[model samples]
Target chain A: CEFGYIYRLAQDYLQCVLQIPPSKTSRVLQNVAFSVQKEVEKNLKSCLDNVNVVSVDTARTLFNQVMEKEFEDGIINWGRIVTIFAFEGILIKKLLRQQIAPDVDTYKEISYFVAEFIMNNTGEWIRQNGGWENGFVKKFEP
Target chain B: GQVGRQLAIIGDDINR
Candidate 1:
């Protein structure tokens, strides 16, 4: 399996149309996140649990594990980047629906961890693939 | 005061 791109292109939200979050990464990737959420939305709500509350470490660990699972084959590609962001979008929506979205300082904390995924996992891969426009977005369109 | 319309999280500008 050959994969290439940001490996991260997946964080940025908390605003209407994600003026900031989506912009935080790639404009195109932001839509990828939205598209991915739509594709998976039909079934996730049923899997959600309103009674249970997730802890900080738990959420962070899950995020890392999700990406780690994808990287298992030793590949990082456009699809992975798309999947990562889409996955991020779904988590945010889940938190919102559960009415457990972290606010105040925790908002920053949550976003920080989310961005950190990109910071460590996908940043270099993104650059290697031609940086978003050439690597992530353009490659994705084709 | 709010400025823009709040999105439905899954809907809004990007509709499913």
Candidate 2:
């Protein structure tokens, strides 16, 4: 799982959990972003394998703050979501390289972790938005 | 060139 691999996995997870149409952009409310990140951190501690990166928590916290500020206008755009994922994606790849020999197996482990993280957070967001049957929001091009 | 190609794949995934 190279950085690009995890990155694409994240995109797929987002689309699947959000039930976003292929031609449409996925979005959520400001509070949805905040709550999603909160749940993500909580689950990262208990549900997923521990990430070795020293800065992961700090980076996620900062990303959450940015989400708060950037989405103050009320809608969290797909661009912002993807940017945050890219930051974590590259950070994980760098940390993994430092700790172990970069290989396909190690990459797969890290990629799976990221995929789970995105799936859990986005799934929670879908629930908060009134469940999957009602969670699909209006399409907005970013 | 390989890295760039991979990066482009990611970019395409995000865009589409």
Candidate 3:
């Protein structure tokens, strides 16, 4: 599963986090994901989905390093969590386009890298802080 | 611009 538990953890976590009273259930996260999606499109567009594209492993490693820099402050907030998911969301979109498939093997592999990092680095803190259920949903109760 | 998984939805039953 490659620490695949995040597939379960993140969607709910993000859903709750974005359910602010001013917005619907998911727009805030949607906008964030869209921004991230565009950011990738602007910068990485040339090589992405092309034969010159980096391997999934390289994408994982590079993204992991960038994500680590963001988390280096040790803040561990929902926004940061969403940022991670936003990147994952866009990265998967990229792979889907590259492979033109529903469930690409590269998609599975890249997602695994994220979960592995999150589990090794942030799992216990998240759980103790009430995790996806209480931390996000209840905390942002609407 | 649909892709792999739907975000913030209830179930994973739908693939498209």
Candidate 4:
């Protein structure tokens, strides 16, 4: 696995891939925001009902709890976890959007909150998961 | 886009 190089390059690659024009923090947040938006539209179409609508506070609380729980397990694949949360955030964002426009402060806050949370933890996440090269690597002869 | 980069890396790795 090119995990080492992947991790090394991720900082730059993810920044550009997401077209994150500012700093790494902003880049990650933007990427997370995009992920959330896509997931909501693709998978949460049935969330139009009152019962299915998810609030921002509830979403953040739920995510924080889950993240804390996962952190307690000793080691975690943070990349995988971030991806999961990114999608989940989207689901919640969609529910919120149904109630208010996307530009509303409350709506934007959810994106910031989730993105900030992931960015804050990503370093520890990479450390615990053994960095990018932790999974697979072998001599190549082809 | 992210997936494609990773894939491109792996693709290069395999073709080596």
Q: Interface RMSD for every prediction, one decimal? A: 12.9, 10.0, 11.4, 11.9
lDDT by residue (tens digit), candidate 2, B1-16: 2222232333334434
Q: lDDT per residue, candidate 4, B1-16, as tens digits?
A: 2322322233233324
Q: Against the true structure, what is each candidate's TM-score?
A: 0.63, 0.33, 0.57, 0.39
lDDT of 4 at A12: 38
Q: Whose TM-score is higher: candidate 1's or candidate 2's?
A: 1
Lowest lDDT sum, 10 consecutive residues, model 3 chain A, at: A16-25
lDDT of each residue in A86-118, candidate 4, tens digit only? 444444544545544343445445445545654
lDDT rank order: 3, 1, 4, 2
lDDT of 2 by residue, A71-142 (tens): 344433343444444434444444544444444334334434555544544444534654322433332222
Q: Per-residue alpha-carbon lDDT of model 1 for A100-125, expressed as tens digits?
A: 54553343444566666665766678
True contacts kept of each: 0.00, 0.00, 0.00, 0.00
Estimate the lDDT of model 4: 0.42
Q: Where's the lowest-lDDT run of ten residues in candidate 2 chain A? A: A22-31
How would you encode candidate 3's per-residue C-alpha lDDT over A1-142 as one tens digit per residue? 4254465444433333334222332434455545555554555456544532245755676567666665665656554555566666655554444543344345546656767777777787778878655664544444
Clashes of each: 6, 2, 0, 5
Q: Please report how far candidate 2 places residue A125 from its true position, in Å.
A: 2.9
Clashing pairs in 1: A3-A76, A3-A77, A4-A77, A6-A126, A12-A21, A13-A21
Among the numbered candidates, top TM-score falls to: 1
Q: Lowest-lDDT window of 10 residues in candidate 4 chain A?
A: A133-142
